Amino acid sequence: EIKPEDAPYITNAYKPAYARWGFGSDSVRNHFIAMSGEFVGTFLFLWSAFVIAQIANQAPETPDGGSNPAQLIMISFGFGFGVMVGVFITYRVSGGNLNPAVTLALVLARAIPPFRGILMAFTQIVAGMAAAGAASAMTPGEIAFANALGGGASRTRGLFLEAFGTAILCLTVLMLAVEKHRATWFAPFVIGIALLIAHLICIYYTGAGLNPARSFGPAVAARSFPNYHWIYWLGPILGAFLAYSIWQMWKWLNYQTTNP
Amino acid sequence: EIKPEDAPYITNAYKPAYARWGFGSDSVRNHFIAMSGEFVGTFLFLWSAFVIAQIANQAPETPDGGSNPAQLIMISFGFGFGVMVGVFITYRVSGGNLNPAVTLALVLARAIPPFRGILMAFTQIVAGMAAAGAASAMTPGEIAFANALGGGASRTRGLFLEAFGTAILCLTVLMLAVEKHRATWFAPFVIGIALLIAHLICIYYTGAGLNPARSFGPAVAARSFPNYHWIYWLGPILGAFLAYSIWQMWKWLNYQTTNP
Amino acid sequence: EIKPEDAPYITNAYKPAYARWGFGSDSVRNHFIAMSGEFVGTFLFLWSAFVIAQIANQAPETPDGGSNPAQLIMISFGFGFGVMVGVFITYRVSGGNLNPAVTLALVLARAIPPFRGILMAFTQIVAGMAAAGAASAMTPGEIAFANALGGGASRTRGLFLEAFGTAILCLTVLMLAVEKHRATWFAPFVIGIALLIAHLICIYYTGAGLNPARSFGPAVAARSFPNYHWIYWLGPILGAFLAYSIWQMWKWLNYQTTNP
Amino acid sequence: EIKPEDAPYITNAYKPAYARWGFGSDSVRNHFIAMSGEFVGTFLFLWSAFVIAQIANQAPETPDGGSNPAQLIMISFGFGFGVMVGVFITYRVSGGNLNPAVTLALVLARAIPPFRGILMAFTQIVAGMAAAGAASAMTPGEIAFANALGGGASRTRGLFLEAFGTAILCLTVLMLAVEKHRATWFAPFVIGIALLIAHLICIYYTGAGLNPARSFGPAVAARSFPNYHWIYWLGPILGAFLAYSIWQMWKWLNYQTTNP
Ligand SMILES: [Ca+2]
Ligand SMILES: [Ca+2]
Ligand SMILES: [Ca+2]
Ligand SMILES: [Ca+2]
Ligand SMILES: [Cl-]
Ligand SMILES: [Cl-]
Ligand SMILES: [Cl-]
Ligand SMILES: [Cl-]
Ligand SMILES: [Cl-]
């Protein structure tokens, strides 16, 4: 027997909001709810992570262009744990996308409809601008959290790094959050670890975009766009399409069932 | 079928104590239970974290005021994992607030009544004093775990850093621990990660208060109050109010339901 | 009561694929599903981890052959968190073995049949080749992610380090993923931590193979096989047999039941 | 509806073995099962952690006696994650105590009977000896994983550090693993984090004993007992008694119930 006072804890699924956006979803109320979750979540994630990167980039310079593992770990924690917290907070509000590339994968998977998806992506972009301006104002010194190529990487290598890192993130969302099972509630944790490793892959070489809202906001705030800024848009878009493609193949194959 | 010997493991919700404080709660017994949980939890959390900070601050000095990412990670682990353990231990005792700013958010949300909340906040303060005195006595050298501004931050920047970091913590409590669902049991983990990232944001600039009991106790023990000590009270109070405000908006909107 | 829209989240077990490979499993469809999961999972895990190791190995050299704890932690995170993500993504596809030594333990335990197991191990090997070639092409500089003895270890010490580290990994798989209980869904997390600690044990001394597909692929890509390369095959094979042996003893004893 | 093939995953509690040691438990079979779990678990935990400490202690020396945060984090990960893995593997075998101080707390709480408890503690001691000898033989150089006072700590400070760190560990076991609820399955994770923070507290000052089997085995292997070795026995024993005392007070108060 479950006592009545325990029942909500046992019966109420901790499921992404988009799983329950059916008929009735096109109200102004419901669009505002989704937008508010994406705004709050994206702001808190990116603001946190930008300040952490600002601090980490005050570490003494490493000679000869070498890497600084502790620095890279710190920045990776700021984005990976930051997104973890943001998605846990907003999971039942908006689904915690916090990333236009994530929303695009979800639109392709027909988890989120296109108009709602556009509203969410524009909200994420505005939140990233706001986060960049707030982190800039709140920290001494010049902005140190904008994306740039490093570590000898070319534009072409950077594009592929960005695309594969984004694919890992998006495939995690699809398999854990979109698919419906007893680990869906835990997806925010796995999404955070995916982003953590994508930052360990990419910071040194690309600064780790993985998220057009993350790359755009600091560029506006610093009034500085490298000519290669397009990699931070195309790379994540290609990663979203790659992840979708793999998910769609497995859905076509009815992966979860031995004997369909 | 569930075997009888397994039933408690399956049916007994691991829910914060305050969720079940209704009629009968105003007994001396029940107030003592709540106070004892907050005392034990806050002591063990802050004592642990103060000793860890003491050790981390014995690292060789970084030139030119630069940051030391490994040092910052270590201190962040001491507070973030420390609070994680403290809240898991005391979740069903007192609810594991361990922070007057957390209790204030819970009072505003009507999760905890005001008198009980005052008792809990005074207990947390006394525990923080005790923890500071014990960490001082048990470690060689001068106290190295008091809060101070650094990294070029002004008082005004420090106030806002403190407020936003505290907001992140408090919004995590509200959405995961107060809201009733299948992830409420896991809230202590997410609360610890929230505190971890708030320390990665704040240590370098403010020393990371985020908790008036954490800032006050070392100040008493070192017999030293900077004139800006008020930021460590007002900042977290403002963060608690911000987090409450966002939660209250979502409750007003019935966020969890598509068609109310 | 569980609402119908919540039911899948509550009822659908997040269980490894091999748990449900009975009659009907020998179709071409089902073999392709298993192979695709192992390919995708092993590629994403090893590619990620190889790039992270490449970066970590750009850290300034430590004098006198000493260790660099932050470097070792970074590499350990790349493999341990990398495998965590890979197994969570592929758990219901292929079971997320990602390691021929893991598949061998599962074959010995009769969790996976021999022919399917061979298909999975050959797929993992090809994925490791592909991952090594892609990480090589995508990063500047020479390959820095191949296995080699270091830290003064002899071949014989390295063989035993490899064997015991692999045993820890394989025993975790057996007790958490093969055994059927309320923590089976969480096995991917524990498997990742097991691999993390096995890397903290082995990187300094052997480079941390723990996985013949991980050791072979970089060796092909660098066109370089040390004469001691056999330790990276025999060590993990012996660890798989050790882990199996302990599991089998406990199964023979009916460990989970007081009164059989 | 739960499908029959999913039922074991949903119904079989992942509960410590000692929870089900009632009538029938005094067979030779059952004592051997408990001993084998403690042997395997304690060996794998301590062997892992000793090798990791050996490596971490090859880091370049820090001037002036200062601390090395990355080194301390690495050693803390080896013990905290090591114990996590060991307890998850052995939870349903022996309950995963892996520490005579833990077993003593459980005996005081009447979770484990005294004779069984003595068998388990002697097994842990022998496993720690075996682990120390194996880590010694498998690594080049002198043993670097024995406990010693450092960081300016006196014997008396070290005794109290050891006692409080052990209390944190033991109180976590009692509240999460002994108490029966929906988070009992997760206790191994929390136990690992508790041990992680206890190492961040103690390594610098005492070497972090926290476990008489951990302190004794290296001392035998190095043929070296400091005259203060008793702190590594009395400290953890006092911590076990402290944790018991707090748990017992809360049990006496019926902490989990508002209106008994
Ligand atoms: Ca600035
Ligand atoms: Ca002192
Ligand atoms: Ca290259
Ligand atoms: Ca040796
Ligand atoms: Cl509608
Ligand atoms: Cl359940
Ligand atoms: Cl009352
Ligand atoms: Cl078949
Ligand atoms: Cl008996």
PDB file of C-alpha atoms in Angstrom, chain A residues 1-3 5-6 8-14 17 20-25 27 29-30 32-33 36-37 40-41 43-44 47-49 51-52 54-60 68 70-71 73-74 77-78 81-82 84-85 88-90 92-93 134 136-141 182 185-186 189, chain B residues 10-16 19-20 62-63 65-70 72-73 77 151-154 157-158 160-161 164-165 167-168 171-172 175-186 189-190 193-194 196-197 200-205 246 249-250 253-260:
ATOM      1  CA  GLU A   1       0.000   0.000   0.000  1.00  0.00           C
ATOM      2  CA  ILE A   2       0.995   3.559  -0.783  1.00  0.00           C
ATOM      3  CA  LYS A   3      -0.126   6.108   1.767  1.00  0.00           C
ATOM      4  CA  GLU A   5       0.457  11.569   1.249  1.00  0.00           C
ATOM      5  CA  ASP A   6       3.191   9.632  -0.635  1.00  0.00           C
ATOM      6  CA  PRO A   8       2.258  12.184  -5.713  1.00  0.00           C
ATOM      7  CA  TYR A   9       5.890  11.278  -5.296  1.00  0.00           C
ATOM      8  CA  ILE A  10       5.304   7.859  -6.740  1.00  0.00           C
ATOM      9  CA  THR A  11       2.766   8.550  -9.460  1.00  0.00           C
ATOM     10  CA  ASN A  12       3.637  11.915 -10.946  1.00  0.00           C
ATOM     11  CA  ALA A  13       6.159  11.300 -13.758  1.00  0.00           C
ATOM     12  CA  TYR A  14       8.984  13.667 -14.013  1.00  0.00           C
ATOM     13  CA  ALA A  17       6.860  19.239 -20.954  1.00  0.00           C
ATOM     14  CA  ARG A  20       2.283  16.480 -23.033  1.00  0.00           C
ATOM     15  CA  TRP A  21       1.802  19.247 -25.572  1.00  0.00           C
ATOM     16  CA  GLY A  22      -1.176  18.070 -27.531  1.00  0.00           C
ATOM     17  CA  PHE A  23      -4.507  19.563 -28.234  1.00  0.00           C
ATOM     18  CA  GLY A  24      -4.905  22.855 -26.308  1.00  0.00           C
ATOM     19  CA  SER A  25      -1.174  23.682 -26.537  1.00  0.00           C
ATOM     20  CA  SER A  27      -2.972  28.971 -26.330  1.00  0.00           C
ATOM     21  CA  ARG A  29      -0.783  30.837 -21.965  1.00  0.00           C
ATOM     22  CA  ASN A  30       0.931  27.677 -23.081  1.00  0.00           C
ATOM     23  CA  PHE A  32       4.222  31.872 -22.627  1.00  0.00           C
ATOM     24  CA  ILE A  33       4.910  29.005 -20.269  1.00  0.00           C
ATOM     25  CA  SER A  36       9.430  31.462 -19.815  1.00  0.00           C
ATOM     26  CA  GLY A  37      11.013  28.142 -19.113  1.00  0.00           C
ATOM     27  CA  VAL A  40      14.894  31.323 -17.324  1.00  0.00           C
ATOM     28  CA  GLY A  41      16.701  28.087 -17.936  1.00  0.00           C
ATOM     29  CA  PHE A  43      19.757  32.580 -18.826  1.00  0.00           C
ATOM     30  CA  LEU A  44      20.700  30.790 -15.629  1.00  0.00           C
ATOM     31  CA  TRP A  47      25.150  33.293 -17.180  1.00  0.00           C
ATOM     32  CA  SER A  48      26.626  30.759 -14.773  1.00  0.00           C
ATOM     33  CA  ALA A  49      28.826  29.184 -17.351  1.00  0.00           C
ATOM     34  CA  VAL A  51      31.123  33.780 -15.317  1.00  0.00           C
ATOM     35  CA  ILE A  52      32.903  30.464 -14.604  1.00  0.00           C
ATOM     36  CA  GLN A  54      35.664  34.327 -17.203  1.00  0.00           C
ATOM     37  CA  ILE A  55      37.336  33.152 -13.955  1.00  0.00           C
ATOM     38  CA  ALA A  56      38.970  30.132 -15.499  1.00  0.00           C
ATOM     39  CA  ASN A  57      40.518  32.334 -18.168  1.00  0.00           C
ATOM     40  CA  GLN A  58      42.276  34.356 -15.486  1.00  0.00           C
ATOM     41  CA  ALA A  59      44.584  31.432 -14.889  1.00  0.00           C
ATOM     42  CA  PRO A  60      48.298  32.054 -15.742  1.00  0.00           C
ATOM     43  CA  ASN A  68      45.804  23.423 -19.045  1.00  0.00           C
ATOM     44  CA  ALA A  70      42.494  21.973 -14.702  1.00  0.00           C
ATOM     45  CA  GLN A  71      41.322  25.056 -16.562  1.00  0.00           C
ATOM     46  CA  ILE A  73      37.906  20.825 -16.458  1.00  0.00           C
ATOM     47  CA  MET A  74      36.648  23.935 -14.685  1.00  0.00           C
ATOM     48  CA  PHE A  77      32.024  21.767 -15.233  1.00  0.00           C
ATOM     49  CA  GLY A  78      30.517  25.238 -15.630  1.00  0.00           C
ATOM     50  CA  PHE A  81      26.756  21.113 -14.530  1.00  0.00           C
ATOM     51  CA  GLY A  82      25.191  24.439 -15.464  1.00  0.00           C
ATOM     52  CA  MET A  84      22.231  19.969 -15.763  1.00  0.00           C
ATOM     53  CA  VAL A  85      20.749  22.378 -13.255  1.00  0.00           C
ATOM     54  CA  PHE A  88      16.310  19.841 -14.132  1.00  0.00           C
ATOM     55  CA  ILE A  89      14.656  23.129 -13.122  1.00  0.00           C
ATOM     56  CA  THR A  90      12.789  23.621 -16.410  1.00  0.00           C
ATOM     57  CA  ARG A  92       8.359  20.151 -16.612  1.00  0.00           C
ATOM     58  CA  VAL A  93       8.035  23.788 -17.698  1.00  0.00           C
ATOM     59  CA  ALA A 134      24.989  40.420 -17.524  1.00  0.00           C
ATOM     60  CA  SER A 136      30.130  41.145 -18.909  1.00  0.00           C
ATOM     61  CA  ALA A 137      28.796  43.769 -16.543  1.00  0.00           C
ATOM     62  CA  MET A 138      29.152  41.717 -13.411  1.00  0.00           C
ATOM     63  CA  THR A 139      32.819  40.720 -13.913  1.00  0.00           C
ATOM     64  CA  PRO A 140      35.902  42.875 -14.052  1.00  0.00           C
ATOM     65  CA  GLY A 141      37.929  42.935 -17.190  1.00  0.00           C
ATOM     66  CA  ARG A 182      11.913   4.487 -16.576  1.00  0.00           C
ATOM     67  CA  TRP A 185      13.331  11.361 -15.524  1.00  0.00           C
ATOM     68  CA  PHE A 186      17.176  11.086 -15.349  1.00  0.00           C
ATOM     69  CA  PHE A 189      21.819  14.262 -15.648  1.00  0.00           C
TER      70      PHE A 189
ATOM     71  CA  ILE B  10       9.208   0.568  -2.815  1.00  0.00           C
ATOM     72  CA  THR B  11       6.434   2.351  -0.958  1.00  0.00           C
ATOM     73  CA  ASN B  12       8.089   4.680   1.517  1.00  0.00           C
ATOM     74  CA  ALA B  13       8.718   7.997  -0.287  1.00  0.00           C
ATOM     75  CA  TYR B  14      11.956   9.656   0.351  1.00  0.00           C
ATOM     76  CA  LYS B  15      10.338  13.108   0.763  1.00  0.00           C
ATOM     77  CA  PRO B  16      11.403  16.229   2.667  1.00  0.00           C
ATOM     78  CA  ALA B  19       5.987  18.019   3.188  1.00  0.00           C
ATOM     79  CA  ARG B  20       4.366  16.250   6.104  1.00  0.00           C
ATOM     80  CA  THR B  62      49.122  32.421  -7.944  1.00  0.00           C
ATOM     81  CA  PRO B  63      50.911  35.383  -9.371  1.00  0.00           C
ATOM     82  CA  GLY B  65      46.047  37.816  -8.763  1.00  0.00           C
ATOM     83  CA  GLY B  66      45.224  35.088 -11.314  1.00  0.00           C
ATOM     84  CA  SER B  67      42.883  32.230 -10.568  1.00  0.00           C
ATOM     85  CA  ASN B  68      43.830  28.658  -9.610  1.00  0.00           C
ATOM     86  CA  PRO B  69      41.286  26.361 -11.185  1.00  0.00           C
ATOM     87  CA  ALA B  70      42.225  23.257  -9.197  1.00  0.00           C
ATOM     88  CA  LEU B  72      38.589  26.561  -6.925  1.00  0.00           C
ATOM     89  CA  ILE B  73      37.352  23.095  -7.906  1.00  0.00           C
ATOM     90  CA  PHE B  77      33.571  20.169  -4.147  1.00  0.00           C
ATOM     91  CA  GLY B 151      39.454  39.143  -8.112  1.00  0.00           C
ATOM     92  CA  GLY B 152      38.820  42.860  -8.549  1.00  0.00           C
ATOM     93  CA  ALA B 153      35.148  42.704  -7.663  1.00  0.00           C
ATOM     94  CA  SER B 154      33.464  45.657  -6.162  1.00  0.00           C
ATOM     95  CA  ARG B 157      29.281  43.315  -8.253  1.00  0.00           C
ATOM     96  CA  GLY B 158      29.679  41.035  -5.278  1.00  0.00           C
ATOM     97  CA  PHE B 160      24.708  40.697  -7.493  1.00  0.00           C
ATOM     98  CA  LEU B 161      26.917  37.632  -7.811  1.00  0.00           C
ATOM     99  CA  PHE B 164      22.072  35.306  -8.528  1.00  0.00           C
ATOM    100  CA  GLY B 165      24.097  32.356  -7.159  1.00  0.00           C
ATOM    101  CA  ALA B 167      18.680  32.291  -6.671  1.00  0.00           C
ATOM    102  CA  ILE B 168      19.984  29.277  -8.572  1.00  0.00           C
ATOM    103  CA  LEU B 171      15.008  27.720  -7.447  1.00  0.00           C
ATOM    104  CA  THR B 172      16.474  24.235  -7.470  1.00  0.00           C
ATOM    105  CA  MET B 175      11.298  22.981  -8.366  1.00  0.00           C
ATOM    106  CA  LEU B 176      12.742  19.679  -7.184  1.00  0.00           C
ATOM    107  CA  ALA B 177      12.026  19.398  -3.436  1.00  0.00           C
ATOM    108  CA  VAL B 178       8.820  21.413  -2.952  1.00  0.00           C
ATOM    109  CA  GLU B 179       7.111  20.290  -6.130  1.00  0.00           C
ATOM    110  CA  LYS B 180       5.890  16.755  -5.752  1.00  0.00           C
ATOM    111  CA  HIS B 181       6.939  14.220  -8.369  1.00  0.00           C
ATOM    112  CA  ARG B 182       9.080  11.180  -9.073  1.00  0.00           C
ATOM    113  CA  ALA B 183      12.346  13.198  -8.908  1.00  0.00           C
ATOM    114  CA  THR B 184      11.690  14.809  -5.503  1.00  0.00           C
ATOM    115  CA  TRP B 185      13.775  12.056  -3.824  1.00  0.00           C
ATOM    116  CA  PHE B 186      16.785  13.139  -5.982  1.00  0.00           C
ATOM    117  CA  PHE B 189      21.827  15.613  -5.551  1.00  0.00           C
ATOM    118  CA  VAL B 190      20.643  18.530  -7.710  1.00  0.00           C
ATOM    119  CA  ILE B 193      25.330  20.505  -7.970  1.00  0.00           C
ATOM    120  CA  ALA B 194      23.597  23.898  -7.823  1.00  0.00           C
ATOM    121  CA  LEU B 196      28.872  23.494  -6.645  1.00  0.00           C
ATOM    122  CA  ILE B 197      28.300  25.761  -9.637  1.00  0.00           C
ATOM    123  CA  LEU B 200      32.574  28.135  -9.184  1.00  0.00           C
ATOM    124  CA  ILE B 201      30.842  31.482  -9.915  1.00  0.00           C
ATOM    125  CA  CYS B 202      31.499  33.202  -6.614  1.00  0.00           C
ATOM    126  CA  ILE B 203      34.641  31.993  -4.752  1.00  0.00           C
ATOM    127  CA  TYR B 204      37.056  34.079  -6.766  1.00  0.00           C
ATOM    128  CA  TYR B 205      35.035  37.280  -6.438  1.00  0.00           C
ATOM    129  CA  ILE B 246       9.824  32.778 -10.558  1.00  0.00           C
ATOM    130  CA  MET B 249       4.724  32.845 -11.453  1.00  0.00           C
ATOM    131  CA  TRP B 250       4.868  29.257 -12.687  1.00  0.00           C
ATOM    132  CA  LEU B 253       0.246  29.689 -14.526  1.00  0.00           C
ATOM    133  CA  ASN B 254      -0.320  26.003 -13.515  1.00  0.00           C
ATOM    134  CA  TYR B 255       2.857  25.216 -15.424  1.00  0.00           C
ATOM    135  CA  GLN B 256       2.598  21.411 -15.180  1.00  0.00           C
ATOM    136  CA  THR B 257      -0.763  21.157 -16.905  1.00  0.00           C
ATOM    137  CA  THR B 258      -1.522  21.799 -20.547  1.00  0.00           C
ATOM    138  CA  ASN B 259      -5.259  22.246 -20.135  1.00  0.00           C
ATOM    139  CA  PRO B 260      -6.244  23.454 -16.620  1.00  0.00           C
TER     140      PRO B 260
END
